[model samples]
Target: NNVTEKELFYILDLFEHMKVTYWLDGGWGVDVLTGKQQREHRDIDIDFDAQHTQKVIQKLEDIGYKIEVHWMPSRMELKHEEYGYLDIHPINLNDDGSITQANPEGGNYVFQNDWFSETNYKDRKIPCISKEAQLLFHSGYDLTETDHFDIKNLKSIT
Candidate 1:
């Protein structure tokens, strides 16, 4: 249910080489804030501008990832035998700095200007969703053990 840090770094390196901006979300974002992995991740959540959406898809496909689920203009799930799973969310960046998120509820979910930042991970500055922003996403559902773990730990450190 998880990719190794080595495999994760390889995808990050690909994004760097492609010059695409990706904002980390979910457990990986939490780990980025903690500066290391706290526990096993079920999947990686990564979002980027929809402008390069197709390019990202082509790139991942070329590298042997296949689309396991697709709800175009919103989300896509990709899987690889060796790399585990990736949950890719696409959004639009606005001129005023608020990002346009795709909502199944059929309304705009614009984020604040400072929703993202760079955190240190193995000596590299990695893009991640801010802790406050991360906190905002953890509610509205029953908490699982993993959710409890993330909230308790991320709240203490950040």
Candidate 2:
């Protein structure tokens, strides 16, 4: 389940056609911000509008991907028969444009109003998580080799 640049755009286009509002997150998110691929990614992470969860689930099912894991309000992992892993995080939209998501520790994990931003990737503008917010997300965890590269990659993003 590898997500190359081609597969990335294909998935984004699928969501756009289905009217699903999402922002790229995780490894793919950071790579997009940097405007280049720094390493291999087996999956594409997405922060989807919580309201569209069902739509995403059903659609991906029809296309041959099956739910590998589903922890609502936190994350979902879908596996494709051929080659793809969709790691989805659902964000609860607030009235002011910020977002709230379930925190494993009990209370909600909140994001700022401007945490959702876009970046230029392969000559096209695509929605993605803000670099600052991404920096915050990357913290509070033990660093993996890939994680370390992405953390430093942020300095080169802008």
Candidate 3:
């Protein structure tokens, strides 16, 4: 399959333009966080600010993209026609940079140095979850085959 970084960049650019900070947080994120592309990515995963949903979707749609909003009681998803999809999670932050995540788990998802570590993706810097957090999330919890692939590979690499 043809993986389109150029298109992904377009979407990222939109977020950048909107002044939204998001971390690439799934299969592709693992690649960036690991500094190596062990396997092809099936789709892209991203987390964003929940408050910007309307603005973000409008901006994307004005640029000839279609977005679909999905709710599942706990999490929400935004699917786009041109790019792919992004999982939006609203967070409350303090002036000191501490953040409060609004999920049942109740943890800070602040963009700390530890959380926003950098890795190379063709010489470009990309942000992803910490290796420790990645491993924790990759554990068995109704993950897809691709998720299993990430877990196994991450374990081997770590």
Candidate 4:
């Protein structure tokens, strides 16, 4: 019902080879904190510098990922029907190290530099949104059973 670990690593490895900087988001990010895969992930979310959008798209497309939706200058959703969904948030990095993702509504979704950190996934260090950041993103939406499950697991570790 979701992407497998092998598929996940393939994409990450491709990014690494292309020298793309990214931070993992969504449920896969929580699994990174635990250094393991915990459950099925409907999509892979990532954050990257807005300046790198063209390179990112070209590289992913070279490998068959296609842009399914785009909200230009900010967000895009790519999909490889045979693989999985990739939700990308292009961000502007501030000189102070904080980041801002533009909203279509003209506001910005801000994140402090402290909101990002390294974590392990299968013993390999991976960049990911901090648990604090993940928790913040999870708020205000109607929670699904999967979200409840994730929050419970995240809370158990602290």
On TM-score, the candidate that comes out on top is 1
Task: In model 4, state the lDDT of residue 29.
Answer: 84
Q: Candidate 2, residue 61: CA error in Å?
A: 0.8
> TM-score per candidate, in order?
0.93, 0.92, 0.71, 0.92
Tens digit of per-residue lDDT, candidate 3, span 1-158: 43366765666677787898766777777766656777765456666566666676577568764445654222455555545665555544346765445554554444453554556677776655677767665656688887777777777775
- Candidates in order have lDDT scores of 0.84, 0.85, 0.62, 0.82
The weakest ten consecutive residues by lDDT in model 3 span 65-74
Candidate 3 local distance difference test against the native: 0.62
Give Cα distance to truth, residue 38, candidate 3, Å: 3.5
| lDDT (Cα, 0-100) at 155 in candidate 3 | 72
Off by over 4 Å in 2: none
Q: Which digits, one per residue and each the tens of the lDDT, describe model 4 over residues 22-57? A: 788888888777667778887888888788889988
User: Best candidate, lDDT-wise?
Assistant: 2
Q: Which pairs, if any, clash in model 1?
A: none
* Cα RMSD, each candidate: 1.4, 1.6, 3.8, 1.5
Among all windows of 10 consecutive residues in model 2, the one with the lowest summed lDDT is 137-146
Between candidates 3 and 4, name the one with more favorable TM-score.
4
Model 1 ranges with Cα > 4 A deviation: none
Task: Look at candidate 2 and tell me the lDDT of residue 86.
Answer: 90
